[PDB]
Every structure is written in structure tokens, then in C-alpha cells.
Design a protein around this ligand. Structure first.
Ligand code: ADP
Ligand code: ADP
Ligand code: ADP
Ligand code: ADP
Ligand code: ZN
Ligand code: ZN
Ligand code: ZN
Ligand code: ZN
Ligand code: ZN
Ligand code: ZN
Lengths: 879, 899
């Protein structure tokens, strides 16, 4: 019927709830972070919709997925095969481009094979291929009585087509295509797989369809050009728990007279040229002590430090040894394929004057403009009719979702969470399906407010195509434009998990019991600081940052304040804030090997000792890591189990209760507790270790109890419940208090790092630094901490962030969310528009000064919000 | 929007066609065999629906499938995830049952886990398990001042207590202490001397016997947690059948009475005889029992003198401890790890229920748990009608029913869904691989009905297959239900009623192969019926139809006589099959037609006429065996299991087709012979695919796909081999020709011609000589086999047995096939068919209708004789539905004859 009813849902924290979802409409789930949206939307609805379909693809699939673990639900009538558009399902596995992911490149390959005019490299003339039917009608269009000899002698008049057709047949059979008249050169046939770099049937030999080769870089070899060579200045030759190269280094220095303890910056160019590139055949006396202790004198003609790295990387046939040498190397465009990844004769076929590689190299805009100005013939346009419209709609979708700044050539594994999510969303719009249950997860992530009205436009277009959407958003604009809106459980964890209010946005907005509803009408909101932290003389000063789309950018960052880097997606925020600033500061302060982006210099580095990048990357890459392990709480929590009498008499200490060591862990899962099961076309799944039923330890370890709870149940506790459980212990309590303030409090201590969200993982990291003795000289960089947080959750995360600034430290954040931006003291709005047309400072200073900039897109949307919230405070102030 | 539009389809023979299908309705694709229905319905619409969805399940999913070969279509907008209901996606793989495939068995495991009462086999008392909370209030219900000593197993005494009121504190903690010392078990000696005793686990108070906890996997046979140890959840053993070791209990032992020991072993008999004094010239029947036991079961250690002449000729005397003829087979079968030596010994063995698990397939303690007085295995062993009855009569408590409410309804619905489809006769225990094509297909339909999916595009393939005309309205009724659940159905049918009941009806291409591929007429079945251009409408309107014969072949004096057949549900049946006539064995599904026709009749005639090894079904005897020399069973099974086989091969035409190439001018000078052109010999085949032509790609959850070899582009031969030409076409090109274009092309060679003609006469002619057998329809395969027998010198003493030869044919096509079958009867042979298609039944000269209703309410002869004689039997469903068709077409002819 016209609605999908979900009877009795008990996912995680869902309280055996029933809910109605209006079919064929735009539904939007909302509520506090942890209330249980995903549990319903994804773990319950998407899971069933998908399983029920796949299950019916064969008799085998049903048997496999049948014995598997299903979602805890009584029933769910009205289901449709479901499709998810989240960060998990997208790709991140190298050799894959944006063009390949979106499927556009495949249509390009097909395009080139159908109408691509092949040209001769040497001659630049289009090599043709005619049948006898086309040759005869072209020869016949000459003046009469014109003697011609096929090599038999004929004379053209009128009815000679009988011979000419048969004479050219004998000639072609006597001398045997797309060949060049003046040199034989050819390429038999034009098939799509000739333009594929994932097929040796048309891939570049000297790189195997990779495009970029990989050589040594002078920058990575020596991080800071000013380092004492005695204390290891050159990186690759650092004591690897065994000293051979450190001794060779001395042998070269001692011979040429290179001072060991001098900073490399003030060392003559020749002194350094011998060490890096070699003696050039001149023998150097070299004696060294083996790890055993015995000496061995040689007389080698030192190759140098650079050729050494290239030669050691080249010669090994190990996926382990290479990776140790790849840390001091960087990619370079392949000299043969010019970085286009195809054969030389594959690039010989061009369409609108440009070849397959050049079109892939264009940004979505450039290439969209290209296909409008492509001037084809009648024959060409009639063939490519549908192939062309396909490329035009896909480029269009991408442009709609706000990704028009990135090229089709761009590697897949270098895309942001939001970028990937939206590339999948665009790629899906292209499938033009109907009667499907699309379930999206916060599609505005990494998208500016300006470009939000199109996202609402495309979602509704997809909905109007006969589908039903279920989006999980926290944005006002989208919730107001939704047809139906479901708010979930008051509070989060054991507190939420119920349907607080459901109805039209007007109804939910006027519902007193809706936590979200109150924020929509204005009865509850984020307040603007009455006064803002005026900056002082402490400034960072990046100079001449050019990297990607940056236009010789030169900006100044005020320390000891809440800084917010803003600007539309593609403007170069990542580049300036992370690729340039962080890596740069990082190798100076922490001496990390990360090569910074192209920039001139950065001053004011004498104002801080440590820069920390609170990334949105995972906490760990296995179920070993968890909030406890990362924060070291679990490390401290084991001492208490070692204190109990059971552990004393049995002789247990802080090892039997460990998670990694052989002591008391479960041998069947090797400590994991959760075995990963293999899903081929579907994403991987985690099934509990059937030997210890997911308890993490054998039957003899967890017998030790501390307050009626064993080590398993204590690790299974929640953060909120645990700080109540560990009220007395004053060291364990301080670490749990960080996790609570952070924004969690609802997640469990044992919860495997792999399952944690992007935003969740970031806060577990933010919690580790949260409570530390700060010296007032330390910079924190957070990339969109709002990702996955309710408007209310931002208010409590801002209180936490602003606590760091009060101390004196700095907190730089990259946000599009207007509420986090308005709370900030200083902001740096980046590039007008994205891509090539951006990459420059549009407006600096306090939110108000930025707001009154007619050219800033950020300030334009911030002005009605600042004036919206300024009147609300004045409305509360008077009452 | 409100309709699914397909623009420019070119699948196989489709002529770049555009077509509109109404969304959310019962659309029925119809037309001649090979017109292009599957090419559109399955190879185009369904193909796209599945891919587009699966292609979105993950990143890797897109990369794998995207690089492969997508269907030949310009655009197809308005798609929905598609699901196919055909024979290609039904499990034929051992260890799987009807219960597992339908998912009903899983719900039963969930039922038995939740509410299943576990009882002690030894003591037959419901073993219980109580928490401390339940133990305390049970003791507190006793009268006051009643002394009790809580002791824990000699049994150490915890503490004595007097029950008053506020003693719930101690009582609860002493039990807790007792359960901690004796581990989940504690005995309470009430001083009235009634030592009641309970535990935290499910255990018997009188013998220990426990079961721990009830979990679904404790009832599964695909889990060590529940599977039987002595057979590993198979339920069937595999041991030597005494009946197979001796075909008839009265055959001369001198002329090899025992079959396994049939040309060392012959000379060994001589040794066990000489010794025990068993006569050589012997009709086994009259041999004393001990004389036969020594030879079959062994001397039991006693030494027997045995000398024998080797194949070489030299003698070698031994002094062995003879094992016997029966243990010989079991021992020679078990020890070898050869798929060749086993299969030769497996011929003398038959399946037998596992003595450990009574054939139920689970642990003894798994069968300890029972619901309505019956255990899991018993409920599975019932027929669908039985089980459905059991749950109606099943009587439970308030808690049990409230716990199993959602489970019971699902089980109750699936049983009914199976009943709707007509499968109410088969059990839940029945092996999945033993199902027919129609059955498997319908099981998949029923399972699907239960999914309750919406916005799905189901594509059914002739769901009426193997279904009596009576049970057709229920099929039409359930299809529509699935439709009326927000889904669109695309059914490929040839039945009138199903077309008449359809909403939209597309008639595809006039003619088959290159002659078809177009959309002739498309609208309501009223619009298509009134369209002179629709070849289908002409049969629905009644302009064209299959005429009833003027007179029917009266049986002569020759009759086959099946006596006392009792195999599956057959009830001591005795039937007379008339020879030299077209016979139709009719009846509702489950009546026992297969059983009678193939399992009893064919296997019996086969063992007598051709020394076939198959063990016939339980029957008394079969006379009239002197009236025929051979019995050809034109099975609906595949022609080959590899792409190496194809029409050309099976018929043998491809053998001759290489002799022309081997004898060509270019072959002479190149030294090529009838081997370079061999599809299977390294000589000239493509070394990349080893002569397959198509590589098989590995789809994990999806069925496997066939990708053309990228090196020979599917041609099958290398570059040099196909340079040889014959009349401007090489071997790859001739292998790619249609049977119709081929006979036209090989008109000069009459030996090639006469084979190709059979394929044309048979109905084919649209398919290509090189079409992989793995891709042929069940019906197609049958007809390619029929074409083999089709042309041979008939001596008038052979019997043909075809199973539903109509499967996959238009009404117009049945006409031509009937011409072919009746030509066989004309020449003196007999054709027996097992059909539901009334157009075939009415044409028959004699029909043998089977059992009224299916299952155990069947397996008996309801009516025999001519179609009219059976038309007048009220008790025959066949007649009831046939009587009006005879009256309809008999009037149509008089209407035609009068003008
Ligand atoms: N991977 C997981 N394993 C176990 N429990 C989880 C997992 N993810 C979330 N939960 C539980 O579900 C609740 C949060 O549900 P979730 O769907 O994440 O809410 P939201 O969608 O609003 O973030 C938490 O109380 C948490 O304990
Ligand atoms: N790894 C990369 N390779 C090529 N181009 C890149 C890469 N990273 C960023 N860019 C380009 O730089 C510009 C902005 O990138 P980014 O720093 O992510 O901006 P923002 O953070 O504002 O989205 C875009 O034009 C983008 O295509
Ligand atoms: N796998 C295949 N290989 C080659 N030809 C095929 C294949 N499948 C179908 N065809 C051909 O396509 C034509 C019609 O398709 P088909 O689906 O058989 O029609 P219908 O379903 O109406 O019988 C026939 O000539 C048939 O031989
Ligand atoms: N392999 C088998 N094992 C057990 N029972 C069977 C088997 N095959 C058929 N039966 C049973 O025999 C009965 C009818 O036999 P069948 O020959 O299949 O009828 P029909 O051919 O008329 O459909 C049914 O009750 C069916 O369940
Ligand atoms: Zn040239
Ligand atoms: Zn290259
Ligand atoms: Zn384990
Ligand atoms: Zn007992
Ligand atoms: Zn068994
Ligand atoms: Zn090949």
C-alpha cells in the first residue's frame, strides 16, 4: 500500500517501537546524536530491504545469508529493495578514478570507439577505412573518360561499377583497415577496451595503467634542512635497531671532511653533493662493526644516499621492503603515457581535437563546456546521440551535487567523506530506478550552505522519479523542505530510542515534546557570544601557498582563539589548512615525514610547541582498538582487576586481563572477540566468536568479578554508566569524563574502532587531548566536528572547544555549518566559487566584518543568521 | 512514473524494438517458440533490473559487474529491481530440502527453540529449568512450619529452614549457594519426605540427561550443534540392496545370476560352490536359505580352497577366508577414492534411512524436544496438507501462543502459499534435488510470495508448467495477489486462461528466429484477440485452432499390463497401456503419473529390453513385454553439461561437418584433417579458452555468467584454423548458422541435410548449431533428443515416452509437434506422454487418467479409455475440464464444415 509500517523494532537502543513511514515521499529522520536514527534507518530498514532482495537472487544466496544474523524486528510490511548512500559503501582502493567510479569514463571509452577519428602520429592526417561500396561511389564522381589503373586499366563512364567493384576486390585480396596512407601505421579496430587502463588490451606498458611512476624526492630524505647530522638528519639512514648505514655515513663524512654535528643548512653544496649523490667512482675507506661485534673493512666506491634508496626499492620483490622506501619517494607523471595511462596509439584517437586522456583531465565544468561546443557531423551525432547525452547528464548530476570542481582523472582514494558520498549519490541518480527505498546519511556533509538548495532539488527529483527517500539530517533547510519528518527518542542511548514526534515539519515544529521541534521554531537555539576574543600580537603567517587551486595565497592566523576556515567546497580549505599549514608545522615541531604542500614560508612558529591534527580517520583498523584502548582507560582499568582477591590467589595480574597477550584471551578469535565474515559483492559483516560468544576472554579469565561485574561486562558498559560505576576511582574517572564532555556518554567502552563513525572516531581522539596540562602554546585542527551532530549537540561540543581557547591554546576548525561559524571569534573565508575560479582569501576577520562582505558567499548566508539570532536574544532579554 | 518503457532492444533476434509495459499490472508476453520472449523479458528487462541494483550494493560490486557484458539495449527507463522465477535459479544440490528452500524449516527451528518442550527420552517427563526467583516462590507456597533441608550434590547439607513468611531472604541465598557448589542443581528434602528437585539447566530429576539451552541451531542439520553424528545431517545411508544384486529371484547361476560378479569373480563362485556343495545349474528361488547365505554373507572365517587361472593363463592357488558377495561390494566401494570405481559399485546400492536418527537428521537430544506431542523431524516428515492441519489443531497455552504468535503465522502462511501453488502434496522433508522443473519453479514462487516485497518487477517463466488445468485459477489468483501488493509481473505464458486473465498482453514477433523479434500486437486480451495480425489472437478468438481427429485409433490386440504397482502413493494399481496408439497419461499433480510412467513402467521395460541397471519402482509384474523391442525415454534433461556439447554435436552433424572442411582445397595443402577442425582437440582450437569459446566467470551469490573468450572473440578456433573456408564461410561461421539457414546451406550434402531436417521437423530451426547445451531450455533439450530418434527405420515395435513435451510451446507449435508424434504412431510405434495441456490430451487416441486429487488422496486409476469415454466420467478432473473443450472444438469444425 501507500506506506511502509515497521512493527516492533529493537535494533540497539530502540524500545520495541512501531513507526509509519509515508511511501513515495521525502522522509527525514532527526534527533540527538545516539538517539537511534541509524539503528532504525540503516540497521533495521535498509538491512531488511537489502537482505530480502539479495536473498531472492538464488537458492544459494538464501542458504548462506539465511544462517547469518538478521536485524531484531518483529516485522516490516511495505518494504522495497533498499539502497544506501553513506560513506561506507563508496570506494577507496587505488587505480580507480572519479571517472571510473561515476561510470563516465566507460561512456567516454565507448564514445571514442564509435566516433573517434584516429590520426597518424607522424603525419597528423586522419587515417580512414572504407569498404568497396564507399570507394566505388567516390571514384565514380570524377569526370568521364578519365583513365585509371588499379594496382587493371579501366575508363570511367557510367556502368563500369560492375568491374570497378570487382577489380578493387581482387586488388585488396591480392595486397590484403584503419591504416595511414603514407607509412603503413594502423590500429585494426576501434573497440572500447582499447581505451581502458584496467585492461592490457589497451593500457600503457611502462606503468601498467597507473599513469604516475614513482621516484625519490630530495625533500622527504631531509625533513628539516636544519638538523644535526650526528642526531640523524637524513631520514632513511636512521638506526633501524641495527647500525650499518649510520656507520657508512660517518665513513663518507670522515673522508670528505663533513662535520657530523653541524646543521645541514650551513653545509657547503659539495659536502652535501657527495653524501646524497655519491663520490662518482672515487673509493672511500669504510670499516664497520657487525651486529655481532666483529669489524669488517672494505673499499667501496660510495653510490650516495639517493641512488641507494632507488636501488634498494627497485631490487626487492617484497610488499614490505618497498613500503619502507616508499616513505621517502613521491609520484611523478609517467614519461611514456604523459600521465594519461593508455597506449601511445590509444591516445592517437581524438574526438573534438582532444584525446581520451585530455578530456578525462578536465574538471567537470571544463568538460561540460567542452561537450556543449563539440561540433560533430550528421553521421557522428546520430551514432553518439545517446552516449553523449549520458555523459552530459552524469556531468550535470555531479555539478548539481556540488562536485563540479574535481576532474574525471582524480584518483578515488583521495576524496573526502562528503565528496565520495555525493559521487555515489550522483552515480545513483544516473541509474534512474523506481520503487526503491533510498536511505541517505547526512548528504550535506562537506557541502556549503549555498549549494544546499540544489541538493534539496536533486533529492526531490529522485523522489519524484517514483521512489521514497529516508534521509538522516541535522540541517534546518532540508528538514523544512521535507514532506514528512520523524524525530527520534528524547536524549541518547538508554534515554532515547523512541519516536518522539512524527508529522509535517509545521506539525513537528509546533510540537512541545520534540527536542528538534523546539530548535526549529526558535524556542531553543545556539547563542551568539556578546563579545568576541579580539586577537593579539601572536600570529602564524603562511606565505605564498600555491599547491592546488591556491593563487599564491598569503594569509595570517591569530593564535589563542577559535578560528574557523570557511568557503565553498573545492576552494582549497583542505589544501591550506592541512596539506600546507599542518604538515609544515608538523615537520618543524614533531619532525614528521609528511611532505607539505607548495608554499614559501610560515612565521610565528615560535608561538607554539605542538600541533595536533584531530583527524576524522579511524581510531584503529581492527576490533582491538576501542575508546578505552585509545584513551588508555582500559590500560588503567586492568589494575583494579589485578587488585581483587580472585586474581591474587589465582595469580592473575594486568596480563591475564589483557586484550592482546596470550594470557586469558580467547584463542579461537585471537583476542578479537568478533570474527569477520566474507561478503563478496556485499560489504563485509562481523559475526560473534562462537567459542566465547563475543565475551573476548576464555571461560577461566572472566570468572574474576569486581562489584558483581567481570572484565567483559565492565568493557560492555556505557561511558555514562561507567563513570557512575567508577565514581570512587579518581584517575579512571577523569578519563571517562573526557569521553562524556566530548559528546559520547552513549557509546560502549568495548565498542570496536572499526564500527565507530567518522565524527564519533574524531571525538574519541579529541577526548584524548581534551584533558591535558596545556602550556597555552598548542594548536588543534579539527575537520568538521559537526558531522553527525544535532543542532543541540553542537552547543555542547562548542562549550568543549571554547574551553580549550579559554586556556590559551588555539583551535582551528574547517566548517560549513553556519552555527559553528557564527560562534567563532575569527574566520578565514576561502576562494570565491570552487575549483579553478577559487583558491584565494575572499574575506578575513571577525564574523561581522566577514558578514558585511558582499562578495563572500559565507558572509551572505551568515548575515541573516547573525541578525536572526541577535533578535532572538533581544527577544529573550526583554521578556 | 506509471509505466516501464524499453527503447531499442536488440538482445538476440530482437529487431531494435521499442515497447511499453504497464507498471504494477499482470503483463503476459506470448508468441511462438523462439519468437523473442525470454530475450526481452529475461535477457533484457530482468537482466537490467538486477544489475542496476546489485551494481549499487558496494564499490567493488560496480567495478566487477560494470566491466562485464551488459545487455544490448539503448535505454530502458522506469525499471525496478528485478527478480526472476524460473527453473535456472532453483536448487538441485543435495542436502537441501523443500523445508529449507521455502524457509519454513528455519521457522520450525525457531518454533522448537522458543516454545519446544524438552522431555526425557527415558522418563518421558518434561524436564524443566527454574531461575532462583521461580524456585523461591514455589517453596514458599507450601504450608507454614514445614521443615526443609537445602542440600547440594553423597549430598552436602547447606542449611535447614522452616518456611514461614519473611524467609525469602535466606531461602533465595541458600539455593543460590547450593547452585554454586553443585553447579546449577540443588535438591530440597521437604520433611514431609518429598525430595523435590530442580536445576538452572534443562535436566531430568531422575537420570542426569541434560540439554542446556534451546537455540535454533540445535535443530539444524547444517550445524554440528544439531546434525546427526552417524550420518552428518544427511539422514540417508548408502548401502547394498539385496534386490539389485539379483535382478530376478529365478535366473540360472551358471549364466551369472548375481549381477555385480559379471565379466576372477566368476571362478570364485565355482570355489564357494564346490566347497559348500551349491549347485551351478540353479534357479536361485529354489535354493535353500543357508546355501544362499554363505555366498551372499560369507563363511564367517572358515577357509575356502580357491584356485584360479589369471587373464594371462597361469594358475595360482590361495587359501582365503571368503568375505561374501554383499560385503565385497561395500568393501570395494568404500576403499577406492575413484569417481569411476564408486559409480560402478553404486549401481548395486540403494539409499536407506540412517538407523541412528530414524532418518530425521538430528541429534537424539534434538529429537527430544517436541511441540504438539510431535518432534521437529516428525513435523517435517508430514505433507503440506498434513502439517497445515496439525497447526490448526495444535493446542497451546497462553504464554506459548503469545511467544510463538509471529512464528506460527509465518509458518501457517507459507504452508498455504505452497497449497495455492499446488504443492500441498509434497513433504517438508523431501529432498530438493528430487523435484521436477515445474515443482521447483512453483516452490520458488511460493517462497517469493512470502517475502512481501513491494515495487519489485517479478518475471515469471511459464509458471503453469506441470500444473493440471483445474489448479490454474489459484495460480492466476496468487499471481494477482503478488501483483496487488504494489508489484509488477511479466509472465511468459502459452495458456489461454492466463492470457485471458492478464491485464496487458504482448504478442511477440511473427515467427521464430530471424522471422520474429518484433511486437505484433499489444493491448488488453480483448484488443489482441480482435487483431487479425496477432497469430495468438487468432487462437483466442477461435479463427485458428487445433482440430480434433475425425476418428481415434482403436487399440489392436497388443497391450502392456502394469500389475500391482504400489511405488509412492500408487494404490495396488493395475493398468493396461494400448500399443500402436497415442496414449496420454493424465491427472492432477501429485496423482502419481511420474511414478507410474517413469519410476515403474520405464525402468521395468528398460531393465528387460536393454539390461538397464536402474531399480524399478515397487510393482508386481508387467506383461506384453514381447510386443516391443525398445523403449526410448525422451527426457527433458540437458544434452550436455559443458559448452562442448550443442545441437550439432549431439545429433552428430558436427562430425560430418568437419569432413567437408577436412576435404576442402585449403585443408588438403595445409594437411588439415577431421581433427584440426575439432572443437575439443588442441590442433586448431583456441588455446586461451581450450576450445570452450566462452569463459565462465565466478559470481558468488549470483548465478555464474558466461563471458566470451576475449582472445577468439567467441569464435572457438584460432586465427589460422578459421582461414579455411567452405562456400565463403568458415567453421566458426557455419557453427553460428541457424538450423534453418544451415540445411539451406548444406543442400548438396544429403547426409548433413537429413540430420538438420530432423531438428527442423522437431520444432527447432531457429536455434544455432553451436548453441551451448548449458543454455538450452528443458523443452528445447527434449526436442534436440527427439530429433535424434526422429529419423530411424521403425520396425513398429518401439515405445516413446515424452514428459510434458509441450513445455515452452505456443498453441500453433503444439500443432506441428503433434504432426511429428502422430507420424511415429502411424508407422506402428507407440507414443506415451505425461500431459496437462488439453490440446494434446484431446488429440490422444487413448488416455489413462490418474488418482482423484493429489498426495495420498490419489495414486489410483480414475478413468481409462478414449477422450470422450473419460469426458463422461464425473469423478475425473481431467474429463471435467476436457468435456467442454471437445464440445467447443467439435462445434468450431461443424461451423467451418457447413460453410
Ligand atoms: N556498532 C555498534 N555496536 C553496538 N551498539 C551500537 C553500535 N552502534 C551504535 N550502537 C548503539 O546504538 C545507540 C546509538 O544508535 P545510533 O543509530 O548510532 O544513533 P544515531 O543514528 O543517532 O547516531 C548507542 O546507544 C549505541 O550503544
Ligand atoms: N589530491 C588532489 N589531486 C588533485 N587535485 C586536488 C587534490 N586535492 C585537492 N585538489 C583540488 O584543489 C581544489 C580544492 O581542494 P580542497 O583542498 O579539498 O578544497 P576544499 O577543502 O575547499 O573542498 C579542487 O579544485 C580540487 O580538485
Ligand atoms: N544463449 C543464446 N545463444 C544463442 N542464441 C540464443 C540464446 N538465447 C536465445 N537465443 C536465440 O534467440 C532467439 C529467440 O529468443 P528466445 O528467448 O528463445 O525466444 P522465446 O523465449 O520466445 O522462445 C532464438 O533464435 C534463440 O535461438
Ligand atoms: N523422490 C520421491 N520421494 C518421496 N516421495 C515422492 C518422490 N517423488 C514423488 N513422490 C511422491 O509421490 C506422489 C506423486 O508422485 P508423482 O509421480 O510426483 O505425481 P505426478 O507425476 O502426478 O506429479 C507425491 O505425493 C510425491 O510427494
Ligand atoms: Zn603515417
Ligand atoms: Zn604510462
Ligand atoms: Zn573468542
Ligand atoms: Zn530422566
Ligand atoms: Zn543420522
Ligand atoms: Zn577462445
Amino acid at each position: 500500500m501507500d506506506k511502509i509500517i515497521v512493527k516492533g523494532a529493537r535494533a540497539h537502543n530502540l524500545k520495541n517501537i512501531d513507526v509509519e513511514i509515508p511511501r513515495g515521499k521525502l522522509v527525514v529522520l532527526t534527533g540527538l546524536s545516539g538517539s537511534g536514527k541509524s539503528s532504525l534507518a540503516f540497521d533495521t530498514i535498509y538491512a531488511e530491504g537489502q537482505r530480502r532482495y539479495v536473498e531472492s537472487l538464488s537458492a544459494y544466496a538464501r542458504q548462506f545469508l539465511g544462517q547469518m544474523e538478521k536485524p531484531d524486528v518483529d516485522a516490516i510490511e511495505g518494504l522495497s529493495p533498499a539502497i544506501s548512500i553513506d560513506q561506507k559503501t563508496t570506494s577507496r582502493n587505488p587505480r580507480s578514478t572519479v571517472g571510473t567510479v561515476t561510470e563516465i569514463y566507460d561512456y567516454l571509452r565507448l564514445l571514442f570507439a564509435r566516433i573517434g577519428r584516429p590520426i597518424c602520429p607522424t603525419h597528423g592526417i586522419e587515417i580512414q577505412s572504407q569498404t568497396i561500396e564507399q570507394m566505388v561511389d567516390r571514384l565514380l564522381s570524377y569526370p568521364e573518360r578519365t583513365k585509371m589503373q588499379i594496382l587493371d586499366r579501366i575508363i570511367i563512364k557510367d556502368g563500369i561499377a560492375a568491374r570497378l567493384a570487382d577489380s578493387l576486390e581482387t586488388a585488396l585480396k591480392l595486397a590484403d583497415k584503419h591504416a595511414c596512407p603514407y607509412c603503413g601505421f594502423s590500429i585494426g579496430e576501434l573497440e572500447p577496451r582499447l581505451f581502458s587502463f584496467n585492461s592490457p588490451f589497451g593500457a600503457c606498458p611502462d606503468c601498467d595503467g597507473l599513469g604516475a611512476k614513482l621516484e625519490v624526492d630530495l625533500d622527504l630524505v631531509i625533513p628539516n634542512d636544519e638538523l644535526t647530522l650526528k642526531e640523524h638528519a637524513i631520514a632513511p639512514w636512521e638506526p633501524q635497531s641495527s647500525q650499518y648505514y649510520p656507520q657508512l655515513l660517518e665513513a663518507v663524512c670522515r673522508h670528505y671532511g663533513i662535520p657530523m654535528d653541524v646543521p645541514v643548512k650551513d653545509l657547503p653544496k659539495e659536502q652535501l653533493d657527495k653524501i646524497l649523490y655519491g663520490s662518482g667512482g672515487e673509493p672511500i675507506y669504510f670499516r664497520y662493526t657487525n651486529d655481532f661485534g666483529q669489524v669488517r673493512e672494505q673499499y667501496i666506491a660510495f653510490e650516495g644516499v639517493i641512488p641507494n634508496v632507488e636501488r634498494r626499492y627497485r631490487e626487492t620483490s617484497s610488499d614490505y621492503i618497498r613500503e619502507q622506501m616508499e616513505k621517502y619517494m613521491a609520484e611523478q607523471p609517467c614519461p611514456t603515457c604523459q600521465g594519461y595511462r593508455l597506449k601511445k596509439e590509444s591516445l592517437a584517437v581524438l574526438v573534438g581535437g582532444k584525446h581520451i586522456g585530455e578530456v578525462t583531465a578536465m574538471s567537470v565544468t571544463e568538460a561540460l563546456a567542452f561537450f556543449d561546443g563539440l561540433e560533430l557531423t550528421e553521421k557522428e551525432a546520430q551514432i553518439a546521440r545517446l552516449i553523449l547525452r549520458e555523459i552530459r547528464d552524469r556531468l550535470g548530476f555531479l555539478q548539481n551535487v556540488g562536485l563540479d570542481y574535481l576532474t574525471l582523472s582524480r584518483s578515488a582514494g583521495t576524496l573526502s567523506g562528503g565528496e565520495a558520498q555525493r559521487i555515489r549519490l550522483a552515480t545513483q541518480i544516473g541509474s534512474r530506478l523506481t520503487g526503491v527505498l533510498y536511505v541517505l546519511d547526512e548528504p550535506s556533509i562537506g557541502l556549503h550552505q549555498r549549494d544546499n538548495d540544489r541538493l534539496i532539488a536533486t533529492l526531490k527529483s529522485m523522489r519524484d522519479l517514483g521512489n521514497t527517500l529516508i534521509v538522516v539530517e541535522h540541517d534546518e533547510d532540508t528538514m523544512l523542505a521535507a514532506d514528512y519528518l520523524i524525530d527520534i527518542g528524547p536524549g541518547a542511548g538508554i534515554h532515547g530510542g523512541e519516536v518522539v514526534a512524527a508529522g509535517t515539519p509545521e506539525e513537528v515544529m509546533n510540537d512541545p515534546n520534540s527536542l528538534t521541534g523546539q530548535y526549529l521554531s526558535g524556542k531553543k537555539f545556539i547563542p551568539i557570544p556578546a563579545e568576541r576574543r579580539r586577537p593579539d600580537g601572536r600570529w602564524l603567517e603562511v606565505v605564498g601557498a600555491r599547491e592546488h587551486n591556491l593563487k599564491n595565497v598569503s594569509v595570517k592566523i591569530p593564535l589563542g582563539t577559535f578560528v574557523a576556515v570557511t568557503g565553498v567546497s573545492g576552494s582549497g580549505k583542505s589544501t591550506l589548512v592541512n596539506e600546507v599549514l599542518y604538515k609544515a608545522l608538523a615537520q618543524k615541531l614533531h619532525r614528521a615525514k609528511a611532505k607539505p604542500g607548495e608554499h614559501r614560508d610560515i612565521r610565528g612558529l615560535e608561538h607554539l610547541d605542538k600541533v595536533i591534527d584531530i583527524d576524522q580517520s579511524p581510531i584503529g583498523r581492527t576490533p582491538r582498538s576501542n575508546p578505552a584502548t585509545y584513551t588508555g582507560v582500559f590500560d588503567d582499568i586492568r589494575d583494579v582487576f589485578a587488585s581483587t582477591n580472585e586474581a591474587k590467589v589465582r595469580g592473575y595480574k594486568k596480563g591475564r586481563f589483557s586484550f592482546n597477550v596470550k594470557g586469558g584471551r580467547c584463542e579461537a578469535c585471537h583476542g578479537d572477540g568478533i570474527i569477520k565474515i566474507e561478503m563478496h559483492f556485499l560489504p563485509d559483516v562481523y559475526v560473534p566468536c562462537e567459542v566465547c560468544h563475543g565475551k573476548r576472554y576464555n571461560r577461566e579469565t572472566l570468572e574474576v568479578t569486581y562489584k558483581g561485574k567481570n572484565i567483559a561486562e565492565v568493557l560492555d558498559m556505557t561511558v555514562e554508566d561507567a563513570l557512575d560505576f567508577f565514581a570512587s576511582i579518581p584517575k579512571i574517572k577523569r578519563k571517562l569524563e573526557t569521553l562524556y564532555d566530548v559528546g559520547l556518554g552513549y557509546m560502549k567502552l568495548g565498542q570496536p574502532a572499526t564500527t565507530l563513525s567518522g565524527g564519533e572516531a574524531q571525538r574519541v581522539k579529541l577526548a584524548a587531548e581534551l584533558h591535558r596540562r596545556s602550556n597555552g602554546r598548542t594548536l588543534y585542527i579539527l575537520d568538521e566536528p559537526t558531522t553527525g551532530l544535532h543542532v543541540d549537540d553542537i552547543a555542547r561540543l562548542l562549550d568543549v572547544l571554547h574551553r580549550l581557547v579559554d586556556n590559551g591554546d588555539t583551535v582551528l576548525v574547517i566548517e560549513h555549518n553556519l552555527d559553528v561559524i557564527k560562534t567563532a571569534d575569527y574566520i578565514i573565508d576561502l576562494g570565491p566559487e570552487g575549483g579553478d575560479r577559487g583558491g584565494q582569501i575572499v574575506a578575513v576577520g571577525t564574523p561581522e566584518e566577514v558578514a558585511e562582505v558582499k562578495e563572500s558567499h559565507t558572509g551572505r548566508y551568515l548575515k541573516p543568521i547573525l541578525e536572526r539570532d541577535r533578535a532572538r536574544m533581544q527577544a529573550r532579554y526583554e521578556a
